[model samples]
Target: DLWQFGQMILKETGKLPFPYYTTYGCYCGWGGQGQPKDATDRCCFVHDCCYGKLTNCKPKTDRYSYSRENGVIICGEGTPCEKQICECDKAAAVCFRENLRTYKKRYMAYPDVLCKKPAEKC
Candidate 1:
């Protein structure tokens, strides 16, 4: 977002960049900032695309609780889902694992960017 020549080019093209070098960087569906954020993000980007191709599960639907712990925002649960969802996440875990090393700081500059919605708790 420094408005550098190339970043600006991507921005104009409706592509987002962050975490590193891709528009899918921040999140797959409803979380994180933008631009696969980095090479690692594209891993999940492909993963989400994989999930989208499946019929057993419709969508994540954002079902559950969230909390900021250790400078990371995480969804607490409601994780149990269809087999493909489980399988999809298994691959995602691996994606995150490899991308973790490429993860950068300051991507958190966008406050609550990862919160798809307000807390669902009552």
Candidate 2:
């Protein structure tokens, strides 16, 4: 329900950027396979990494950041996402942090991560 609301907001604001496919990736430490499903995934890991630096202390999903349209700085890249690397943090840091924390907390409760087989790309 809320996502729909967000969609409406995006529509009204004319900032959907739907035609563009924004490349979304996360550092998330353990890449490849064995990542937690809907829990400790790449997005969450990046979320935590981003949140660790903030003082506001907000959940990842509830936050967002804005940055220059630079290609060098990426979410998974190190330190670049910090204030020094780009300006997107101001708009995205909070939402990313909250989303990451929520994911980590949820993952901690689950025992099975449904990891992929060794040498297998997931």
Candidate 3:
């Protein structure tokens, strides 16, 4: 029994069954240092998602950023531009999905669990 238990431990330690990641370099956010600051004090950017259609115009992506009373700043709009903005949405979705998969493969224990909140004890 002791030998069997030791073997099981070895097998479990040999490799991780679940993969979880917190970031994928795909996510964009306000970049800065020191204490948390607002958009005006820092440069905020957001992952811009859009369909790659002619109607969507060009792509000018950013992390969360400064906003006005009218609305929050989204990726800037460009004219006389190719149909890149629409394509950006597709690319962003793939990036996010892939990141999610990576996170699950690394972190998820059951491979079927989805947490509504951050894991406090995992």
Candidate 4:
């Protein structure tokens, strides 16, 4: 797929075509699943943490399982928990698109990432 091609390109180029940045190194994956690939991944880590705050009341769907239907950011007819969940997902998506250049598919498995995974904190 497109991601495999990106890995091939990284193998050939030996460099990221874009700059990468991060503030909070982390487990990176939701539920502490994967490593932090870049700032974008860290955003997902933070988002996971945000949802954890409402696990008992969060929506019964994965963050990617939902759609906005338009340009709206608010979770209309929102409960307090749903509102926060919406905000968390919105921030993560923003982080990904904002750093689309650095968000190489290869990052998740690449090395010399210049980021250190922290033991704790979102």
Candidate 5:
């Protein structure tokens, strides 16, 4: 993956160059140095299952700054909802599902399982 990324960069820029990222802070505000920053970015989170066990899971693809208002921010060399796949094991507890369940009512609590709420007891 890194090799392909380098090749892409070379092909696009005609030469290898310094690699840097730009966020709201690193680009406009106090820079990528402090917290409480209102910058949108791509990230991942390991969410523990709220039901029977302590199992955790990740998103189906590399997270893209999963924000409610503005949507997601793509990560380096990753597209939205493409490269992330929920795959958690017992020891690692880091799996992600390909689908998610949307809450019909924001007044309700967050869903428990991926792809659906209450998971149909399956």
Candidate 6:
């Protein structure tokens, strides 16, 4: 019932209620071996490899900066974060509805199929 309500809300808006941005981050030496002491150090590592000031941290390709659309300065080859597609969400919801409807239809008829003979009056 709640999911159906949520679907109604999404249908009215034609968009997801929440924003979906691309993933970006890295686990530098922080909390591991001899690592940086503060948040500044971790952010610097992500920024260095992702944006500018390439440092010795040498993060992998997965670590990249946020997208320009999100207001972050991206300066790398990797793709930037972006909002999710409303059409895709709608399509997925449609598929879910169909699947649920099919399952319910099959279940509702199963009991009647099993009890073919009419029962005696009480």
CA lDDT scores, all candidates in order: 0.43, 0.32, 0.25, 0.47, 0.21, 0.27
Residue-level lDDT tens digits of model 3 in 27-108: 1211111211222111111122132233434243322112123432132333433224322432333333333323323222
**Candidate 3, residue 28: lDDT:** 23
- Best model number under lDDT: 4
lDDT tens digits, residue span 30-86, model 2? 332344343324433433344555544433233233222452223233343333222
Superior candidate under lDDT, 4 versus 5: 4
Q: How many residue pairs clash in each candidate?
A: 9, 19, 19, 0, 13, 0
Quote each prediction's TM-score. 0.43, 0.23, 0.24, 0.53, 0.19, 0.19
Clashes of 3: 19
At residue 86, give the lDDT of candidate 1. 40
Best by TM-score: 4
Candidate 1, residues 76-110, lDDT tens digits: the string is 45544444454454445445555556655444343
Give per-residue CA lDDT, model 4, range 6-115, as digits (tens): 22223333333232222222344233454665666666576667776866664324232223455433334455655565566656555555666675555543443455
lDDT by residue for model 6 over 1-122, one digit each (tens)?
22322342244333332210011111122211222223322332332233222233322222333223443223333332211122222223333233332222222212222322322221
- In the range 1-122, model 5's lDDT, one tens digit per residue, is 22333333233323331221112221111221232111111111112122113223233222322111332222333342223221111111111111112211221122222112121221
Of the candidates numbered 1 and 4, which has the greater TM-score value? 4
Our model 4 lands, by Cα RMSD against the true structure, at 9.5
Residue 66 lDDT, candidate 5, scale 0-100: 19
**After aligning candidate 5 to the native by TM-score, how far in Å is the CA of 105 from where it should be?**
49
State residue 91's C-alpha deviation in candidate 1, in Å.
0.6
The residue-level lDDT of candidate 3 at 60 comes to 38
Q: For candidate 6, what is the lDDT?
A: 0.27
- On a 0 to 100 scale, what is the lDDT of residue 76 in model 3? 38
Query: Residue 96 deviation, candidate 1, in Å?
Result: 0.4
Worst 10 residues of 3 by lDDT: 36-45
RMSD score of candidate 5 (Å) = 16.8
